[PDB]
Design a protein around this ligand. Structure first.
Ligand SMILES: NCCc1c[nH]cn1
Ligand SMILES: [Ca+2]
Length: 223
């Protein structure tokens, strides 16, 4: 997260870190056994880390649970990043509490102008490279479809939205991939892609989760 703030330990209780020897992506806990992330975060040997603040230090609220299976969206295209969504099932159910909690799925799509919270352990620099150990947060509005398409000609599908600031300075970045965009207590987005970070007229692009609720529910119900 570039131009954000330190969230505070366990203040974003649905935020997970995906770890394969190291943090490589964010995710969102949506029930005791399931995490939603980006399809471009797919790899084998995933351990889900819940209750994290400092990802380099065991602080006492963590639960580390190995993934039993991952399900990339059937229509995910890695070239265009269309349908950039994946489900991860935990080998055992997380113990839910005030610091490890699920986030609700949307019942309807959020509009341009809706204020959201984007979070992650990604790069905090727009030119250089610096990775924080503690969770970073950014409050950001959803941008209009028209401004999103104008920012990225030929690249924005009906399964994507832009959020952030056309002036630059505040954005998600490398390592935030797969993490949450939460608006009014609903998971509306997944950190998906952009052109660099926090650059003028290049806001972050997010997977439009409301399009996937039926798939998520049906997949969970049979797996
Ligand atoms: N807005 C950029 C988010 C991102 C994803 N991967 C790398 N960067
Ligand atoms: Ca920790």
């Amino acid at each position: 997260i570039v131009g954000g703030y330190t969230c505070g330990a366990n203040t974003v209780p649905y935020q997970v870190s995906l770890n394969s020897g190291y943090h490589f992506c964010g995710g969102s806990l949506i029930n005791s056994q399931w995490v939603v992330s980006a399809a471009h975060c797919y790899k084998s040997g995933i351990q889900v880390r819940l209750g994290e603040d400092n990802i380099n230090v065991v602080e006492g609220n963590e639960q580390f649970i190995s993934a039993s299976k991952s399900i990339v969206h059937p229509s995910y295209n890695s070239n265009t990043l269309n349908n950039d969504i994946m489900l991860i099932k935990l080998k055992s159910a997380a113990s839910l509490n005030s610091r490890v909690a699920s986030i609700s799925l949307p019942t309807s799509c959020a509009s341009a102008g809706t204020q959201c919270l984007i979070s992650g352990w990604g790069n905090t620099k727009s030119s250089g490279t610096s990775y924080p150990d503690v969770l970073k947060c950014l409050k950001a509005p959803i941008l209009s479809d028209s401004s999103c398409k104008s920012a990225y000609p030929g690249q924005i599908t009906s399964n994507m939205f832009c959020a952030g600031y056309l002036e630059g300075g505040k954005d998600s970045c490398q390592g935030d991939s797969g993490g949450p965009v939460v608006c009014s207590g609903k998971l509306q987005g997944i950190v998906s892609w952009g052109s660099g970070c926090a650059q003028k007229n290049k806001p972050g692009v997010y997977t439009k989760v409301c399009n996937y609720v039926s798939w998520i529910k049906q997949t969970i119900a049979s797996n």
